[PDB]
Amino acid sequence: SVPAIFLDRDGTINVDHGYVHEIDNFEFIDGVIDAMRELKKMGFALVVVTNQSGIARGKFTEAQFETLTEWMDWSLADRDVDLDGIYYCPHHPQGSVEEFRQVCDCRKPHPGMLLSARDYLHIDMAASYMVGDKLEDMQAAVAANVGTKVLVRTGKPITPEAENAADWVLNSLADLPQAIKKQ
Ligand SMILES: [Mg+2]
Ligand SMILES: [Zn+2]
């Protein structure tokens, strides 16, 4: 029913400084808020799908993630970017925090989060995009039938394996609207 842009968070929306969990260490990457507003204007739903194993690691709590996520959601809404959904996976099989220690269906490369978003927001997966900086993001997208897999260079220098699983490689999410328009 609606096309969406699925978005990784660290390395794609914010600079990945290391288990980011505080407002004062959350830096939006150049041009992404403007690009996101334009993607909403084009008609795309926007959905964040982020692995946050820092929670399972005990680096920060689900409460602190919630606080930072609320701050981010407000900051975007206030600049006219209303996110359609925000999904996150706090688990890790070796988690030190018992509550979050498990294999799950939501940890990318597993496509769980994308499937839930799909069912909840009625998303046309074939008309959608996944944007992220890691192999795991592109593997979750292929499992979820996302039409275009986009890798960005704003986080981790990509690996050849992440490149192989992607359809496009862009410098940044900032460049996605133009890249889509040229289609
Ligand atoms: Mg990332
Ligand atoms: Zn999970």
HEC-encoded secondary structure of 99-127:
HHECCCCCCCCCCHHHHHHHHHHCECHHH
One-letter amino acid for residue 175 of the chain: D
Is 19 assigned to a binding site? yes
Query: Considering every ligand atom, which ligand is closest to the CA of 93?
Result: 2
List all residues 6 or more positions away from 16 whose beta carbon is below 8 Å from its beta carbon.
10, 133, 155, 156
Domain segments of the chain as ranges: 1-183
Distance 76 CA to ligand 2 centre (A): 25
Helix spans in the chain (H): 32-42, 54-57, 62-77, 112-121, 135-143, 160-165, 176-181
- The set of catalytic residues is 8, 10
Helix and strand element counts for the chain (H, E): 7, 6
How far is CA 38 from each of CA 11, 25, 41, 104, 160, rounded to the nearest angstrom?
A: 20, 25, 5, 34, 30
Residue owning tokens 């133009």: 178
Is 122 assigned to a binding site? no
From 126, 148, 124, 121, select the one nearest 137 (Cα to Cα).
Answer: 148
CB 39 within 8 A of CB 176: yes
List all residues 6 or more positions away from 109 whose beta carbon is below 8 Å from its beta carbon.
135, 136, 139, 140, 143
- In the DSSP assignment, the letter for residue 5 is E
Distance 7 CA to ligand 1 centre (A): 9
Distance 154 CA to ligand 2 centre (A): 24
Is 92 assigned to a binding site? no
Phi and psi at 51, nearest 5°, equal: -80, 135
- The rounded radius of gyration (Å) of the Cα atoms in the chain is 15
* Secondary structure (3-state) at 10: strand
Paired strand residues for 89 = 51
CB 146 within 8 A of CB 139: no
Residue owning tokens 């192989």: 164
CB 5 within 8 A of CB 85: no
Query: Considering every ligand atom, which ligand is closest to the CA of 49?
Result: 1
DSSP3 helix / strand / coil % (the chain, rounded to 5): 40, 20, 40
Query: Considering every ligand atom, which ligand is closest to the CA of 154?
Result: 1
One-letter amino acid for residue 95 of the chain: G
Residues comprising the chain, all counted:
183
CATH architecture type of domain 1-183: 3-Layer(aba) Sandwich (3.40)
Residue 88 belongs to what H/E stretch?
strand 85-89
123: tokens are 């998303």
